[PDB]
Ligand binder design. Sequence first.
Ligand SMILES: Cc1cc(CCCOc2c(C)cc(-c3nnn(C)n3)cc2C)on1
Ligand SMILES: Cc1cc(CCCOc2c(C)cc(-c3nnn(C)n3)cc2C)on1
Ligand SMILES: *C(=O)CCCCCCCCCCCCC
Ligand SMILES: *C(=O)CCCCCCCCCCCCC
Ligand SMILES: *C(=O)CCCCCCCCCCCCC
Ligand SMILES: [Zn+2]
Lengths: 285, 285, 178, 252, 252, 29, 29, 29
Amino acid sequence: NPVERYVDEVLNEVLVVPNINQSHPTTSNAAPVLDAAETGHTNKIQPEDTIETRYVQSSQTLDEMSVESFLGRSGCIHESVLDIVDNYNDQSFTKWNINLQEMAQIRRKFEMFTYARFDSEITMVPSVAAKDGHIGHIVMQYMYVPPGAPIPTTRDDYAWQSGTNASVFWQHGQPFPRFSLPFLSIASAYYMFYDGYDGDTYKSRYGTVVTNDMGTLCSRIVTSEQLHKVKVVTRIYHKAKHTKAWCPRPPRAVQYSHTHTTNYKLSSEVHNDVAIRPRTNLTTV
Amino acid sequence: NPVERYVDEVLNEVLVVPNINQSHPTTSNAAPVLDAAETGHTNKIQPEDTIETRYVQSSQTLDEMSVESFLGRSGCIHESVLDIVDNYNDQSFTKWNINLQEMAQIRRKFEMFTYARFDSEITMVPSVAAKDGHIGHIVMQYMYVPPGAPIPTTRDDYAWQSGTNASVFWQHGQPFPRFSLPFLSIASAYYMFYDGYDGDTYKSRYGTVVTNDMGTLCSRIVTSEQLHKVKVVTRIYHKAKHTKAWCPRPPRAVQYSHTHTTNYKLSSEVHNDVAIRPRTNLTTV
Amino acid sequence: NIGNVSMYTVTLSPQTKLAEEIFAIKVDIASHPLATTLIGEIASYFTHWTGSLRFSFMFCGTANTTLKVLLAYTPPGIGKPRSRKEAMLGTHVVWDVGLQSTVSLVVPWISASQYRFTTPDTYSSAGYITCWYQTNFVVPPNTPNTAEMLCFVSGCKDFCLRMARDTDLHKQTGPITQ
Amino acid sequence: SDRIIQITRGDSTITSQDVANAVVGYGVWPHYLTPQDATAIDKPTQPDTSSNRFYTLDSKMWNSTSKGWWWKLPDALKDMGIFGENMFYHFLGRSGYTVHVQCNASKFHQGTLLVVMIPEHQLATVNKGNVNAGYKYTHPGEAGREVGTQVENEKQPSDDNWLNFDGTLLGNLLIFPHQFINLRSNNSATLIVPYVNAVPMDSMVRHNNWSLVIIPVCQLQSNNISNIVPITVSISPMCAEFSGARAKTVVQ
Amino acid sequence: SDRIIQITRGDSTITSQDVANAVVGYGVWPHYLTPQDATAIDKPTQPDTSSNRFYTLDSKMWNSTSKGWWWKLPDALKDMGIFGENMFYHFLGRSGYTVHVQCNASKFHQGTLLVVMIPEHQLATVNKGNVNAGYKYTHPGEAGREVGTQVENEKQPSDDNWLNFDGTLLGNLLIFPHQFINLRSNNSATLIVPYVNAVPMDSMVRHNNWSLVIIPVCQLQSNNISNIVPITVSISPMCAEFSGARAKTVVQ
Amino acid sequence: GAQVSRQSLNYFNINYFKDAASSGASRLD
Amino acid sequence: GAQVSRQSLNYFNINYFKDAASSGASRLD
Amino acid sequence: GAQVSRQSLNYFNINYFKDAASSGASRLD
Ligand SMILES: Cc1cc(CCCOc2c(C)cc(-c3nnn(C)n3)cc2C)on1
Ligand SMILES: Cc1cc(CCCOc2c(C)cc(-c3nnn(C)n3)cc2C)on1
Ligand SMILES: *C(=O)CCCCCCCCCCCCC
Ligand SMILES: *C(=O)CCCCCCCCCCCCC
Ligand SMILES: *C(=O)CCCCCCCCCCCCC
Ligand SMILES: [Zn+2]
């Protein structure tokens, strides 16, 4: 019943954990505690098998541990800066080659999977710093330039006409812009990792750069030059919606160094590069 | 079922492409690959006819390629400037002879058809540049003056009363103005091209200027003179809704030079005037 | 040839060496010289493409001129064929010129991914089309020793474009005035 | 039209607007080996479209003095893609073929080619006692053999086209599957032949099942001799299947 | 007995009298591409028994100082009979595998190998900025890579076994299909993996789908060190099918 | 302006203004 | 876009925009 | 989230968000 299901949604009780049943003393030639990890399987022994348990009714739910929940939180993926210093025409617009690899927090979470398919929700948080005192009337334009479309080279480039590309205009004072984007890949899922090249020569590129081109985000202050200089910083937040993930993998153990690559750097004292805290010895808790 | 149709809308699966069927080796005196282009018809041969194909279920849809989608994107068609320099009364208002020929991006798309019929959605993006520091309280008036109605000659002209004409007032800080306009032509469709004149003499006008008069857009800063001078730039965006198009034609190959005319200019090195990139020779890919 | 109708024709003539190459181009829908064709122009208003392409060729020689040509499509993952033998191993059509002037070669959708980028992208380059002499251009005496050929392109039933974008095949470098 | 033909095999399609019908050798269409006729017990590999496709051999030039040409199958295809690989990686092989000979000229040219498919064309040597044709000479590959060009060697086969290179008269070659390419009538010949042998499968490296022989019986003539008139052969295996997989056999 | 196993593929049969069960990667048995998931429209070639058979790679020596070994698929099989030929003659390929790692010692030897199959094992470089692993280094072929032997070059991948050669901790490799070869328990490991990718078929020349990683987690020790203890890997493709036939791709 | 369908999955195709030009993008075919 | 359930406890799962990407977080399982 | 009662005096106890914490003050007793 969709209504019962609805109640479960509201209470967050869609996925319930099993109860613990009462167990008793045993004397058997069936030893559940003994097994063989060589098989590559985890011994499914439960508490009732190794001790005498009481009956307990579980009320815990796994809803929050769902992939939708894990990746369904909006996090920052880019900080765009437009700092008017001495040349408005050159400093009033910029561009970014879109990717979800520049911020460690969300990158690490997505990378716990090999392939992921999801729709995106983008929320932008623009903040205008009044460097000289007033901010005037700031109107921003964020244009999505898919790979192939002409990238504007000046603040008045014809490409800004956005005759076909999707543009979002924001007026200072109005609520934060937000829009959704359908799964964009040309494949069935996004590659979080890609053990391949775009060719078979010594100079072929390796990794997700080959498969994950999302195009360019071009921004510009629509307002013409003003007396007082401003510094507009637009923070882009991304959230995954309607998510699916395949083949889980180990979490990133060392810091990230670059986008589209698993490369890392190690110091002379590697224990400083990982989160493992050295133990005094085996018996010191 | 309107509900099933609705689901198709949400999923964008209204127009599905056909599947590829499995084919087999053939030895026949029926040769589909052979035909005669002289007829003016395209040979309808499909992959199954020239190679041995496998069965494949298509999931691609043509929805996005619909005329509604192609022309249903809002693009800039005019940039109105009101720059207060030294005379408020003269510089606080202006007028534009409406047309969709001044911006290449949307112009080229509409011109891929000979006749088009559609309703219009206009969205305006005003940005006030504080030239002297403050912007005060900016209130704008955009009045549509149909051909024949009196055009205001001063910022306080009686025509601004808008006793009958449609005017839109915008207050700085409020969301972007937007309104719709029904198909305006006196004919059944708009002429994208017109091989005709408004008379039969050597001085008769040629082209769409004869048939596409939409009137005038008159703008003015309603606010009276302020201490600090401002520069208001209003960008008009246009989108076609409920569209129909007839007789497709070749896309514009060279830059546009003027409105209402197909005129163009050629340099001494024509290969620079078209998008064709010179080939080294016939066999150099 | 640009700026001349001759940029649309390929000239054929009696060969002295066998299996000579006639022409070679990329199959990528928005690459040159396909870019300015109607399908290339429309594909440039989209970011993704998929489907099979139909290439047709019409012979313009005299009614008494004969010729057999091999048209081949080479799927990606290899360089363009260096010889007829190399090309012949891929998808191909042997065209015999006769009463019916036109022939069609279909470039099947053979890709790893369901779609490819319309813009030149290494990962999604679709391969090549090469044309070679199967036999030779033969004519009787007193007949022009060269002939032209016209090349056409259109999409098959499975052709489809996706994700609308602005075209890079046209620009505006200044105001358009009255 | 009965003058037109389209043959599609795998990823290849061949056309001709001037054919003289097609011949199916001995009236049997090629087919896979049935369990009643089989002898080797391992499961056969059947490459299907990757081997059963048209392979075009090296073109030859036909001139007023040409004496003939011949190719042997499967030898001629030993270096042709997947089909070639399979015949060397396996002890046993079996296959039928679609042979399409191409030759166009003009309505002012004349000449006639006799295209024949001979089963077990055991070549002879002339005036060399009991010395038989050497392996190397009966395995020219895609290049085939141009009759009357090779500088004689002891193991060199007969080049007597009128004696069928085997001691029988040319005029009786018509008893074998054949067609004529009479320039005034057609510009191609098509022969589909089934697998013919006294055993269900055989070594493709040491036994050539069919021999393609092309002899010009009517001299090529025209008033525009400078225009070269080539002959091109395209052969497509059919129902190719192999058995007895191992390492690749390297010959010589 | 649950300790015994026999795996027959094509013309090859492999046995082991001391196994630790078998693992089927992600619980999915390999299978041919269905028409609903397909995208390439030409008919696939399916070599069957001539490609879906066990291929034994070069053996390696396991000693007290070994750090590990790794092979990438399908790279490791690029030069293996019919399977190899097919991956170079076709643009697209698709395949699953049965991986059987072999290593016997004695009841007086001790040591443990962690055998893992990693999908999309995108290797990292250490302290080399944004320079990525070179094509040549991630395509060692049947020889695979001996961790800790290669004289560093700029494009040389990471040899840090404890960081999985990619920046993640060794102890968590168990999240991937795996097995252990604990000398006191078993003398082999068997993993059957299905085709895993974001596309139905792919280029086998430029994309390695799976990586076989073998890391000794428990040092090999015995009182008879002179006796060499090798590690041998036999891999069998499953449901191999290829598409997009053309000339043979030659790499380098 | 409400086109109420039922299937329950009810559709509400509301037209907020009284002029046809005011409605959004058209349906296809 | 309205999925009207009844139990009375009526549920209204409205989809305000016409693209599936526009909807909120997915339901579980 | 709509608890539709009828008596006509119809009650619409709508719950706009999907978490119980989001609702307003509780009813009494
Ligand atoms: C894997 C994977 C998936 C993605 C897509 C991320 C979404 O990227 C964007 C962003 C952040 C903004 C815009 C954007 N901003 N403003 N507009 C109009 N579009 C478009 C895309 C595709 O990136 N990598
Ligand atoms: C063909 C063809 C079709 C059109 C009509 C374009 C719509 O033109 C406008 C615009 C851009 C603004 C206003 C307008 N702006 N503000 N108001 C109150 N009306 C009215 C029209 C007719 O122009 N050429
Ligand atoms: C159509 O012609 C009129 C559009 C009316 C707009 C209001 C829509 C909201 C209706 C809510 C009524 C709730 C029913 C009891
Ligand atoms: C779904 O496809 C359309 C979504 C419509 C949004 C409007 C929802 C409000 C409906 C109120 C109608 C009141 C009923 C009389
Ligand atoms: C409860 O779970 C969903 C809450 C939905 C909020 C929208 C309420 C307005 C509903 C108007 C529908 C009008 C009926 C035709
Ligand atoms: Zn102030």
